[PDB]
Design a protein around this nucleic acid. Sequence first.
RNA 1: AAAAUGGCAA
RNA 2: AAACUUGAGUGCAGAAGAGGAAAGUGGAAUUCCAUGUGUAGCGGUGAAAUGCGCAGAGAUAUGGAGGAACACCAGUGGCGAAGGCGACUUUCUGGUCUGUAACUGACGCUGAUGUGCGAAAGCGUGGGGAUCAAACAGGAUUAGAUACCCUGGUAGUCCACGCCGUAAACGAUGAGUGCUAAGUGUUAGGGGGCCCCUUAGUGCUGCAGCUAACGCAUUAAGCACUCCGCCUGGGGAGUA
Lengths: 86, 63, 131, 93, 53, 273
Amino acid sequence: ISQERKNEIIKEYRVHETDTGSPEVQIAVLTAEINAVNEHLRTHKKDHHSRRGLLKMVGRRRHLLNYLRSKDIQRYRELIKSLGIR
Amino acid sequence: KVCYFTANGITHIDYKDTELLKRFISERGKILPRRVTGTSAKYQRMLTTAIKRSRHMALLPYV
Amino acid sequence: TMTDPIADMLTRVRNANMVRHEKLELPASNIKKEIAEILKSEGFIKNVEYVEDDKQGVLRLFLKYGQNDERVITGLKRISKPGLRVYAKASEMPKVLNGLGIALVSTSEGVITDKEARKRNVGGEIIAYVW
Amino acid sequence: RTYEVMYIVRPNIEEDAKKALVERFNGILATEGAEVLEAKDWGKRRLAYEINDFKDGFYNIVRVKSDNNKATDEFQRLAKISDDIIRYMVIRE
Amino acid sequence: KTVVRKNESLEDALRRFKRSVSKSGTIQEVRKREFYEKPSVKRKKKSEAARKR
Amino acid sequence: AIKKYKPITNGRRNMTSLDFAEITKTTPEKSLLKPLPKKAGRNNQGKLTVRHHGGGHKRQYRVIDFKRNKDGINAKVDSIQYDPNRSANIALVVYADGEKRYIIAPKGLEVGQIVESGAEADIKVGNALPLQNIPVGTVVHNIELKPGKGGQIARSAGASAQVLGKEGKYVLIRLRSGEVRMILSTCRATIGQVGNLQHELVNVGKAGRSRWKGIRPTVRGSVMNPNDHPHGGGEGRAPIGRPSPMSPWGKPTLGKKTRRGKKSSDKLIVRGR
RNA sequence: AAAAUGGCAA
RNA sequence: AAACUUGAGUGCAGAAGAGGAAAGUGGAAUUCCAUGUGUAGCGGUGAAAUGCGCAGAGAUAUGGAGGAACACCAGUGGCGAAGGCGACUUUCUGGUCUGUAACUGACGCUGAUGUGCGAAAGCGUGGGGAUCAAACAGGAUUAGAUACCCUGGUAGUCCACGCCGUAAACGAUGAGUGCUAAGUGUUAGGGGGCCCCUUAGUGCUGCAGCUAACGCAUUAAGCACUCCGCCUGGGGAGUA
Ligand SMILES: [Mg+2]
Ligand SMILES: [Mg+2]
Ligand SMILES: [Mg+2]
Ligand SMILES: [Mg+2]
Ligand SMILES: [Mg+2]
Ligand SMILES: [Mg+2]
Ligand SMILES: [Mg+2]
Ligand SMILES: [Mg+2]
Ligand SMILES: [Mg+2]
Ligand SMILES: [Mg+2]
């Protein structure tokens, strides 16, 4: 995604100011990235190499979501509903 | 030798810049090897893209 | 990833001892410090130094070499491993090299040599053998 | 994004006709969400190799800045259709 | 195109022509593409040539 | 675009059909409809002159603008519709003045697309220009042989022709057959290719569906009597038993050319199919 | 250019 | 249960790349076709012949058509998980590396079963067809010649979308991590004075150590820990 778009995403989901490492922040950027590649994959269905990149992001997002659930159930539930991932 | 581009501190090679390109092409119009020219690897790649673009626009001869 | 910190400590010493390096620096943990102190006590290693790196600290172990460039530590082996843990009762406590070697054992009392464990009649997990 | 476009016009074209062509295509380059930063006519030059049985051609270079590539694509379509433009190339950078 | 010099031997000009052809390496290229070789083989020969250099 | 029927019956087994997704309106325009009675291969004398034509579903003829002579007025495509009388689909196009006409629907034509005809028209699908104006290497359709008559070539589904070159008054084109022929530059052709490309792939599946389309059965000459066919007669199945396969009317039917000689088109035709 | 073959043990 | 930042991510500032997908545009060459010139061969082999040509071939000049592949650059160069990826342009798009230390705070590693990708050949449907070329046909060779060589030549070779799921798919070397002499070349960086230092690759050489030996050797086949896959005489048999 565009750096500007990413910067908008981080500001929305940041737990505190100057936070780029929050699970919520990282998940949101991944979610936006995942959707972007999917749209590309819809136009270009034979781009197997790009899809592999998507699969890694999906797995990373899943792993971050798993960590968040363990750390805080409320925050996890807030993130999944906010990003519409479930 | 020494890379002309490194020596002259030029970081961009232009296809429109025929005169620069002409130095690094042979009389047959073949792109000269980087060893003979003494150009750096990075700049040899730039030179080839510039030469090929200029050849397309008929600025440089294919043969 | 690193799965056994202790095994690495023993291996570093082994690798350094092979090339006859005077000193080694390793990442420091409380258990590793205790093992190092025992080795110095037994005279296998000459000296131990600890420093704070603002992370987990750094340990410096000074290896001891006999005359004619002899090595005091012949070998180190990790008896208890992350994959399979070995625990021994005081009666079953092992002797290394017929008592010439030492066996590091983790006990309720603390990390101690095999001889000490048998003396106190306290069994423990056998961390390693050094001979 | 900024794109540099170079188009070669046929040598036999009339001077009045050439002027009409360059004006049209420069418009096409700035049609949609685009600004022409500069437009420069290199003029008649000997072609390194003969193109469309022409040993010479008029070179025109135009620099266009746009957020979209719609204008450049529009130029390319019409340039292909146009008989006058013997050679054309669009380069971003 | 090599052009025979004025008041120059044809054989001398032919020698100059031969040198120019050698510089071009056109003959060499023709001999390479006389027979097809497998794509892997081409890379191997190229690598071997580089090792020779 | 092909719907493959599951083998619920032996008749439906192997039967395929078009999805008909492209069709937007299922109803024809009342004004542009004219009656089309069936002839069943019967001439003015009333006798059968072309065999295997008869029956079939009733059809109303749709009026189509093959001429594409309305110039300078832009037309917006209202709908793509199913025409019973042709392999291609047809497009209801409404001109700015308010005239509604049908045209052969080009491939990639969409509802709301604007189409224009004339010399000044842009080279985009659905636009009809004189051949001279059309660039070389352009796929074209609905090509007029005679100027002003209306397009007679490349009207079928998935049909196109390519402009090859200009030769004075004439323009060279390659037809789908593979024939290269000269056509007057004044003649027009629509830009693009005709749609309904998957029409050929359809598997009719059963005999009855052929009967719906007005095709009556074909009896082979071999299974006829001598008086009926040259291939007729014989005890049991018979081989052709003649130097060549023959037509029902006693003319050789394999490889024998039939184009009439001394035709003006012969000079126009450069390369045969 | 062509250019085949040679019992098993000892 | 509560802390920490080294691992692992994220930000920010940079770098290189035949990484991938979709369109568009070039030039060389091959083949075929049409004419001009011209003439008795051309072509091919060890030598021949088939073949082609005298109904004007081959060659040469000009023009057109069409497909395929991109000379030079080009490099133990680069990129990718692997298979692979070499004209140029644009659009869409993945990964990696350097620096900094914003942030997060062990969120890691491996990975049964699964789930995808996967050379070439092959298969289905539609298209295309220049070159090359299984099969097939002449010629030759030979004791024979179902070959090797020669002249042709179909599928295939190409495109799209499915299918197949295998290759000495190889580094015959699973993945993650740490440690253990040096010398030298090169690719993309970083820092400090042509030199030095440093990071991630990619080669060569060579200790300690290892190894049945050959060899490997900071790109381990050395020394260690975790996890997975796999083997336990040959043949029968990758068969029933
Ligand atoms: Mg019939
Ligand atoms: Mg009968
Ligand atoms: Mg009869
Ligand atoms: Mg009969
Ligand atoms: Mg019979
Ligand atoms: Mg024998
Ligand atoms: Mg294949
Ligand atoms: Mg052959
Ligand atoms: Mg296998
Ligand atoms: Mg290195």
